[PDB]
Amino acid sequence: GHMGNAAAAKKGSEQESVKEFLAKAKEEFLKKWESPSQNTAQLDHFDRIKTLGTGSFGRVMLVKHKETGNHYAMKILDKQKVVKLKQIEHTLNEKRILQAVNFPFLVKLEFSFKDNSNLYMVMEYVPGGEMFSHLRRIGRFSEPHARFYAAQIVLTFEYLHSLDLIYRDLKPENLLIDQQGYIQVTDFGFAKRVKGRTWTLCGTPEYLAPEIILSKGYNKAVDWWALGVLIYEMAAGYPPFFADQPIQIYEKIVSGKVRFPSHFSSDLKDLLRNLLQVDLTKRFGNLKNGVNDIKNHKWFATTDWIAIYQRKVEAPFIPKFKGPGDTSNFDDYEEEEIRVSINEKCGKEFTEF
Template identity: 45%
Template structure:
């Protein structure tokens, strides 16, 4: 079974048919019209007729519980892995009997994906125990269900699994139950006491990023904690508010979304989906470079994330491997929106000098203003780095690197295919007006490098990723730097910062609970305050997890 299975027939079915209007770029999520929140209980009961790998069943080095398949349950970017409770190794009947609660703020699909662990013995002897290039466990199939978010309404159904090739009666079926319990209009403001602090997973110049567990549901999240005093001293208040607005307003399968934001007199708190497959930077450092199929997959998903931002007149400005996370199943999630610039129309220019040196576009270095096309330059730099291991104009001396970005010849390697070379030449065109993407994302999608992709299928995550990270549980932090995860997680007490009333008023409106603030068809000026949207987001925001040395 091919891990990605992109074919020319997919292209024939609509290679450029991605959700392209502003009403659809927000994805398969929409705000609950009632404005209420609640809990969704998902119970995976059992599966029948699964096609399990015989070499796994015959591997005497594995325990029976490790041979049985496990499932990954995903809802609104909350993910949990569930091992089978019992079952037969021939796949005729597998039992989970597991219940999981999910925080619900938006209507979204529940995705349940089944995997079987690869046989270490078969792998070492050259026996094919998993799809070539998958880098993880064996994909057995998946189902997608839209829960009924009516209070106490039960769904109790058997669903046919979809294989990489689509719905497949031979892939087996799975029994799932779902019920939603509304909590009604929120009466209690959420705060730090609603979470258990688990581990530190990152640090920046303004604060920490911690892995936390929500006490009532047990779901795992990432919490970004920022000291107000620090951002006031560095004139980064507008930056931070803009990040909050972008995270809360844009909903896309490949963007980490905000669940809650709250504050104390001393600190700001962002609570986001915890995506624990690790940074793309982590995987790229470990492997050196990626094959073309894998690089194409990540580039395509990033293209759709950037397209979403651009349709809402947002420039991302900081695309790099450190700001791209992999989820449980291997899809990308774009994070860290601290350098975004809002309210930039298609041909409108901005002038703020910001970004990461290796990825800066030439027009930004020249200083005559730049457009959304800077994001397509950085996409080209990232694709080049994934294929070769380093950005195209990298130099340890920053000034020399800037000179190379402006004047050096683009060196394309023999290992690159004809289409990838052509795409890189067009994305890394120093003339921003002639750069591929200057007239919108669709012209990049039509490039032969992406010829086999059905963009609608990609958008709805119906392609199986070419690589699945090793993730042991929802709380697993093994894909994050031990320098951080070994630190004791504490929400440290801050001495009274004596911020004036007028300064505190700058943070008015920061608090957020995801209920009915979703944009849908347009960006609302009444929700995203004009004073924030019109601001010039100058300076350099620190990434959530500091960049490692090359």
Template identity: 45%
Template sequence: MIDGLLCSPSRVFEETIPIEHLELHDDSTFLEEPDAPEKTSPSSSLRLKDLIPVLYQEGRYQGEPVTLGVGGFGRVELVTTLHHGKYFAMKRVSKKHIVAKQQEEHVLFEKRILKAIQSDFIVRLHFAFKDTRYIYMIMEFCAGGEIWTKLKEVGRFNEPIAVFCTACVVEAYAYLHKKGIMYRDLKPENLMLDAKGYVKLVDFGFAKELVHGDKTYSFCGTPEYMAPEIIQNQGHDFAADFWSLGILVYELLVGSPPFSSSEPAKIYPKILDGLLKFPPYMGEGAKSLISKLCRPRPGQRLGNTKNGIKDVRHHRWFSSMNWHKLRVGQVEAPTIRLIHKGPCYINFDRFPFDQAKADEEFSGWDKNF
């Protein structure tokens, strides 16, 4: 749980999880064979010292290193290399903070998941480094910025943009669920746009391996997106991801989620009541899809019945989507008009540079990082 590191500060899920309820992931066999041949990394011999910060070219932070996001555990910075001229998002996390919050296993698990994943709808981890103060995850840079930022800029998305964004998430889900991984942290803050306007999932801090047919009992996620069975601690499985998909469709089309409050504790009763109020401008197809994804009983949810995720793809709201063309990157992304042209960091909020250094940490938990 790297604490919404690529998140906007609006809805970071801080400490809602009692630490004793957090599950640690076991190290059993994990994603033995990638579905596709490994795509070559930008350089197999890149070292941490080869990475140099990208600096703001103008504005109040001119000359300072570009920060793409901040979270309770650290920062995400924009870096490049002298030789390749390629950009990366470098997630830098304090080892001392990870130990203090008992997140060692989660961090190791997130790294292992991201290293094994080969999907065009999920952000790639190219390299991982560590020193005495930090662990560093060198991720694919998604130049288009966060879906959350774009949603705030325009208020709400028109239907073609919402359909496209959701379809990208469906493809990411299909890949993960086939591999036995629940995502469990869907929200606009965790969706990034690449330069082509395609949507990619980031932040795998709540992801978990699960055998199909089993349930897990941890209490985790972002309150507005939590399925009723997680709140009631009844045990949950992949169906919880489909609930959150319905919430996402609603938020993309409306600009805010259907169940919300400034206090997380007040959100849960609303979710359990399950009363979805649709604005008059929402189309019938969208209402139908959201209602079927957000059924209170997990076994009745679209995506979680016998045809699985195919039922989601075949829903009429996606009738304009050519799924094969999407998978091979041949759909022209309607999101492209949301992406601003300018310096490579133009689509991100700006943050002042933090010169403070984390304390050193020598417990050795990261020997396999």
């Protein structure tokens, strides 16, 4: 066989130990999901320092909690905007998931509250910036560098999928680098509790699995496809399927064809062909062996999955950090004033927030 007796016994034991972990993690998540947090701070508890990012729903700002001096990232969502953008259920769901999950590579929600006009999700500040910016800046990550990040996504998806959460919006834009060089997954606006199948067309074109594009009822294997896209993009500097317009990207994705840079190792290419596998019955992460097909793949032979989870691996890259409020790793955004209307907007729609 590929493993001798000591290796196989060690590997099987480790696999049962993570099953034991996930079982306990699932119980703690459900208990938190049934009894969630609410109204745990207020706006004047924070100084607003700088906008770190923007989106259709609102803005994310670096804030400083006045009492403690601690910095946080405060996501501000315009309620009326959220309605018009038909994002009520996503936003409520994201906040509900964020307060219920617990994993070292998932951003932690520290406070949440609302006022007449806005919803506020106060998350840990992740000062290293988006993986996106570093990837485009460096050009591409070495395979060990890409592997270090990929390993954390694998563990994170293993965790989320054990909670029956499909993530569905993996991309470097969504992955922040913390001070130790580890990954923080943010943005759960498309995550959903799915034990079986789900049908929503959602995600980012380059990262859509074929079965999403083809309007099938799909499952958590779309996350493993997206992992393949992420690994490819991290290691190549560009994603496997690109084109001027999303429709042409989709034609490439469903085509079953993928080309690799010549500098890709064969181990890497083998993993990618098994993740970027259009046939759901052959895609890694979707077979009887589950995530173990990925974690035991030759490309991950050097990965100490436990050490990664415990964050005992020295990161290949540590972002420039010049203090707790440093925003140098984030781009600059036009600053809009936070106006809290006198009239409560959309009170019914966000009652549970």
